[PDB]
Design a protein around this nucleic acid. Structure first.
Ligand code: MG
Ligand code: MG
Ligand code: MG
Ligand code: MG
Ligand code: MG
Ligand code: MG
Ligand code: MG
Ligand code: MG
Ligand code: MG
Ligand code: MG
Ligand code: MG
Ligand code: MG
Ligand code: MG
Ligand code: MG
Ligand code: MG
Ligand code: MG
Ligand code: MG
Ligand code: MG
Ligand code: MG
Ligand code: MG
Ligand code: MG
Ligand code: MG
Ligand code: MG
Ligand code: MG
Ligand code: MG
Ligand code: MG
Ligand code: MG
Ligand code: MG
Ligand code: MG
Ligand code: MG
Ligand code: MG
Ligand code: MG
Ligand code: MG
Ligand code: MG
Ligand code: MG
Ligand code: MG
Ligand code: MG
Ligand code: MG
Ligand code: MG
Ligand code: MG
Ligand code: MG
Ligand code: MG
Ligand code: MG
Ligand code: MG
Ligand code: MG
Ligand code: MG
Ligand code: MG
Ligand code: MG
Ligand code: MG
Ligand code: MG
Lengths: 402, 131
RNA sequence: GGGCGAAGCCAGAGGAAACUCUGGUGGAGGUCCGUAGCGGUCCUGACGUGCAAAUCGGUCGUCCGACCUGGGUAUAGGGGC
RNA sequence: ACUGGCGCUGCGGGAUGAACCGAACGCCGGGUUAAGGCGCCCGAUGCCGACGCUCAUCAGACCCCAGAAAAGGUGUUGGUUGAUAUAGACAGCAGGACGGUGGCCAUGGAAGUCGGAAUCCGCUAAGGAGUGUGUAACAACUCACCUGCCGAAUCAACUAGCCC
RNA sequence: UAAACGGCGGGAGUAACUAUGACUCUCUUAAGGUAGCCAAAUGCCUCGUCAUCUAAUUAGUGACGCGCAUGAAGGAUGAACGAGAUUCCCACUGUCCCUACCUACUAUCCAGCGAAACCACAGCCAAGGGAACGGGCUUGGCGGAAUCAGCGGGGAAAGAAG
RNA sequence: GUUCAUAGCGACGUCGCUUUUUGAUCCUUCGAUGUCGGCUCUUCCUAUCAUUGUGAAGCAGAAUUCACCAAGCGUUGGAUUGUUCACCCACUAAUAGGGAACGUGAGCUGGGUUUAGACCGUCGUGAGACAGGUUAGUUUUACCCUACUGAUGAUGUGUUGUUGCCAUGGUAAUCCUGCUCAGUACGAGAGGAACCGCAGGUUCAGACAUUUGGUGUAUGUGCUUGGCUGAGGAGCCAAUGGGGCGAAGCUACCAUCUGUGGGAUUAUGACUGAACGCCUCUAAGUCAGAAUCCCGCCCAGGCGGAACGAUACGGCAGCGCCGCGG
């Protein structure tokens, strides 16, 4: 008989293999459709989830309650040191799908990049690409490389560049760089090969890939929660307190017929560490990173047009469980999948952004830099020392400091 | 124009809130909330600025055994106000109105939430203060 | 271990008497709360190839009485009790 | 009730199946059949098989048997009966469609059309004192009835095949 | 002889507004239900009717009474009492909205030790037919070693000659 | 139905379908298939309540009614009752109907029925009975096979690694309100829309912890009871002694963020155009066309492929290519 009252289904069947992701990086799975009329550009980037904070800005949404008003909005900081291009892949269109046609790797592959090719770097002889790089010098190898480029030019439909991150610039323990194929869009195959060939061994900063106040897609793996039951995994209703063999369960897992448990019934297992793709994440700010012209510049990270405070994006006492952010960063609006220091893929939007939520100019008034390691109440060190005055440890130090 | 943003409700069906107007009613017993489609097992809940159906449990005897439209003007549950302000009141209070939105009474004791005042101009006129 | 405080008694006051009122004393009761004991309400809890062929946890009923209990005796099957 | 069968019975066919159809049985070789089949599963039409019917945006496809009726179709195919037509059919395009009489009794207007009876005559090319629309009612249209242009076949009612 | 077992009925007429029948005829009985009480733990019809309690009450209370089928050694009351049945109110709260987090012991992995229930053979489905709900058969879908933690849809699971 | 059979209905008759009613039967089960309801949860059907696209009206507008394509999505909170049903309150776009062993008890519960105790009414001389009322009444086992959920692995490419492709399977978004249009069209008036646009919400989904809230044995830091170490100081025990505040982490529509594009077409309305010298959306040939359908986006990734890297000694030690060398 029919269930007595209608209720919507718990959870989505569009994410059914609710399993641990087979990858840790998070792959793009769909690059923006290429049109030759556009200029040659990259479509993706790799960043690392540093942490969250909130900002104050004025909204320019006419007809809204918050028009010309101040709002406080949570943001996510994604540290994005420049990518290094080390290779080019060409793909050819076949009636069986895209297939890899030819791959050409640059000379002088970085040491952190070469770590990706080894499961045990410590015991390795570091021999990877040692014989390959020799063919960039002799004329016989150089002729073969030119044929590989010419063959890519006349046969391939889409080309991609292999780019890796720079572990030495991050406060993380991992020294193994993250490799990634980033599709090159916007031109003829000959033009994008010439463009990519100039970028070999070069650094591509994030401001060359993405821009201010544009909406991108974030691809990554969510936080792992381990083995979970149906109440936490599928958010089903808890059974009453009087239930004998347990109440954090699903009471009926199917009718007598079809005499099997259907794939659509909520059951316990892995929760979290799933590959997810969130679209429409606006870029509130692209931070400029630390410089040294005469002294170290940090103002270009958290000072606004209305703050004018010499402070960086780093909270007081540092980002919790991440470290200190010293490179370029992207300030995304809202939350982003993954733990701290989880590698994230930023991808250009596959859609056309025409709504007024998109194409809206973002002008920050304030960036919060209070300590996130507790209920922080001070934006900067200097503000805290001015408020509290000298302390006992300052006195005993100044006593020794004469 | 501009519509009301979502706020934390905190007043399900069966909550007894204070009656802040001079109608002689002392409390309002919420029996349903206007505009609630529903969900299996979910109680219809209201925040400030929400029109509710309420009966007065104590007060003048000519108001008791009836159903009155009412609007929540204060709530004890904290709610975010789109500028990072989490505001809550000392008590849950509401006033008795009609379906058109004007009050049966003529004065309001205590503050009225800004979310309720903007959405109901007849309530806002009788408000001593808007918080 | 506490609570209530029956009769009996003392003092004071009011009364013509009959007697009445107040403060103490006294310590009754198949009296009350509640240990040990005895019992076994509910969780329809635990367990349910158990610790256990009836147990365990909490919560409970009664706890000076038709009370609890050892040993010795008597009643034996269409019989006992 | 009658005969046969299954029970007690295997085998060929009915995809499958106690009972249907063929045929009943020692172990084998050759030949030929039954009922049933012969695109491929799967033996056999890999015939230069014959004549038609049928298009389904739920086609149909073999005893028992495993799904359908009344009622419809200007789908198509046959058939039956009747009718018109070179004294010019049919269909299209274009006219008259009246007088008594805005006939009698119904009346508050019902005038040809809210209703009851009867169907007159003349003009003729025809006209119902009306098949319908409609006007409060008039009025204005249309039909059945005839005429002109048009120059060869057409119209109607049934019926039963497949299909819907 | 009923503080023995027990039992305690129908049709006619009738009061000066009407309405009922105090009151009388008969049939019948041994007497024909008195005092009381009630949709009661006793009322089918029935969620009876009225009032109250609620926004809304097949519940509760009060009242009514031709009561299928109330009733006097048991009827009706009435304090105290009850691990008895029921209804409402205040207070209280994770019972709930609507779930979350923490702790102990498990489960889990390891060293050692080490059972039992049950067992035709076994173990992926759809439809068909069939002892009319197949794991096996027919037709199709298909089918890839060895396993771990869970799980309760099936095995018309086990338990017991319903 | 003011006229008018057929907008909407349909008497007298008559043809069907369905198995969500109750019967009829007794084929399976009596060496047992756990017997009502509720809870939870999934899926399916359509005879469509709402929502999308439409045709019709006795469709002026608003509202409503009939029908078509259509099951994508939704169809709620409560009082009484064990109830299924029922009824009322209130919200709502709507509060449609059903199946799955009258789905679902090694999932629960045990209110009901249906053991043994007991009370009442009626029946019986009685024991006792009552699809009459009432009260109290043990809900056992998974560690097996499969299914499903996750987790290692396995076949082949010489070994091993990096980067990838996509067969196939899943699939997701939904509905409402306000402003404007606009007191506008329409209408005598009363009343009273819609398209574009803007701002938001509901249900659902996927996340996340900056903020707010919850937790808190960091047993972190104060306070405090009883006891104990002769006292102070410093501590400990009381199965976490109690309590205030509490980092990190986890976590809440109880905080915050995000949720999407095409194609062929259905119904339907048309174009050209015969059949049938006229007409005709249809016969041939064309057009527009949707919450449906398929794909995209998104999730997984084949006993399915690709490209590329490095490929075994400081000693006799392995390996690759060349020779069609024996
Ligand atoms: Mg339904
Ligand atoms: Mg239980
Ligand atoms: Mg923090
Ligand atoms: Mg519920
Ligand atoms: Mg006592
Ligand atoms: Mg006692
Ligand atoms: Mg007992
Ligand atoms: Mg128990
Ligand atoms: Mg026999
Ligand atoms: Mg024989
Ligand atoms: Mg035979
Ligand atoms: Mg045979
Ligand atoms: Mg057959
Ligand atoms: Mg032979
Ligand atoms: Mg054959
Ligand atoms: Mg053959
Ligand atoms: Mg006598
Ligand atoms: Mg009486
Ligand atoms: Mg009675
Ligand atoms: Mg009763
Ligand atoms: Mg109640
Ligand atoms: Mg009563
Ligand atoms: Mg009386
Ligand atoms: Mg089957
Ligand atoms: Mg037997
Ligand atoms: Mg027996
Ligand atoms: Mg008529
Ligand atoms: Mg039988
Ligand atoms: Mg059994
Ligand atoms: Mg069973
Ligand atoms: Mg239909
Ligand atoms: Mg059932
Ligand atoms: Mg079961
Ligand atoms: Mg059970
Ligand atoms: Mg019971
Ligand atoms: Mg009994
Ligand atoms: Mg008797
Ligand atoms: Mg009991
Ligand atoms: Mg185990
Ligand atoms: Mg697909
Ligand atoms: Mg779906
Ligand atoms: Mg102390
Ligand atoms: Mg001390
Ligand atoms: Mg000690
Ligand atoms: Mg102790
Ligand atoms: Mg706290
Ligand atoms: Mg939320
Ligand atoms: Mg034409
Ligand atoms: Mg058409
Ligand atoms: Mg088209």
């Amino acid at each position: 008989s029919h269930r007595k009252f209608s209720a919507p289904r718990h959870g989505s069947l569009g994410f059914l293999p609710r399993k641990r992701s087979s990858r840790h990086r998070g792959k793009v799975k769909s690059f923006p459709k290429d049109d030759p009329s556009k200029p040659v550009h990259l479509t993706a980037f790799l960043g690392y989830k540093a942490g969250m904070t909130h900002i104050v800005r004025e909204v320019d949404r006419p007809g809204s309650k918050v028009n010309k008003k101040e709002v406080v909005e949570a943001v996510t900081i994604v540290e994005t040191p420049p990518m290094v291009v080390v290779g080019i892949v060409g793909y050819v269109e076949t009636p069986r799908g895209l297939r890899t046609f030819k791959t050409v790797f640059a000379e002088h592959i970085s040491d952190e990049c070469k770590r990706r090719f080894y499961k045990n770097w410590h015991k390795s002889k570091k021999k990877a690409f040692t014989k390959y790089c020799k063919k960039w010098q002799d004329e016989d190898g150089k002729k073969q490389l030119e044929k590989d480029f010419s063959s890519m030019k006349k046969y391939c439909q889409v080309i991609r560049v292999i780019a890796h991150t720079q572990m030495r610039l991050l406060p993380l323990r991992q020294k193994k760089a993250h490799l990634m194929e980033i599709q090159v869009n916007g031109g003829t195959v000959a033009e994008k090969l010439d463009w990519a060939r100039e970028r070999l061994e070069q650094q591509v900063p994030v401001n060359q890939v993405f821009g201010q106040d544009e909406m991108i897609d974030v691809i990554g793996v969510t936080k792992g929660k381990g083995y979970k039951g149906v109440t936490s995994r599928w958010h089903t209703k808890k059974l009453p307190r009087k239930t004998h063999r347990g109440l954090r369960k699903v009471a009926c897992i199917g009718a007598w017929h079809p005499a099997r448990v259907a794939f659509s019934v909520a059951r316990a297992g892995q929760k979290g560490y799933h590959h997810r793709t969130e679209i429409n994440k606006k870029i509130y700010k692209i931070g400029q990173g630390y410089l040294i012209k005469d002294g170290k510049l940090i103002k270009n990270n958290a000072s606004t047009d209305y703050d004018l405070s010499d402070k960086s994006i780093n909270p007081l006492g540092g980002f919790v469980h991440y470290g200190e952010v010293t490179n370029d960063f992207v300030m995304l609006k809202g939350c982003v999948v993954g733990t701290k220091k989880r590698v994230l893929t930023l991808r250009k939007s596959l859609l056309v952004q025409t709504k007024r939520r998109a194409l809206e100019k973002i002008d920050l008034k304030f960036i919060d830099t209070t300590s996130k390691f507790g209920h922080g109440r001070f934006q900067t060190m200097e503000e805290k020392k001015a408020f509290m005055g000298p302390l006992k440890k300052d006195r005993i130090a100044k006593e020794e400091g004469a | 124009s501009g519509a009301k943003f979502r706020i934390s409700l905190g007043l399900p069906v069966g909550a007894v809130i204070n009656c802040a107007d001079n109608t002689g009613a002392k409390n309002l017993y919420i029996i349903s909330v206007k505009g609630i489609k529903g969900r299996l097992n979910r109680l219809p809940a209201a925040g400030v600025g929400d029109m509710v159906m309420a009966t007065v449990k104590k007060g003048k005897p000519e108001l008791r055994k009836k159903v009155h439209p009412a609007v929540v003007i204060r709530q004890r549950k904290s709610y975010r106000r789109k500028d990072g302000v989490f505001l809550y009141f000392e008590d849950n209070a509401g006033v008795i109105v009609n379906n058109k939105g004007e009050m049966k009474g003529s004065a309001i004791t205590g503050p009225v939430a800004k979310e309720c005042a903007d959405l109901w101009p007849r309530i806002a006129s009788n408000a001593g203060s808007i918080a």
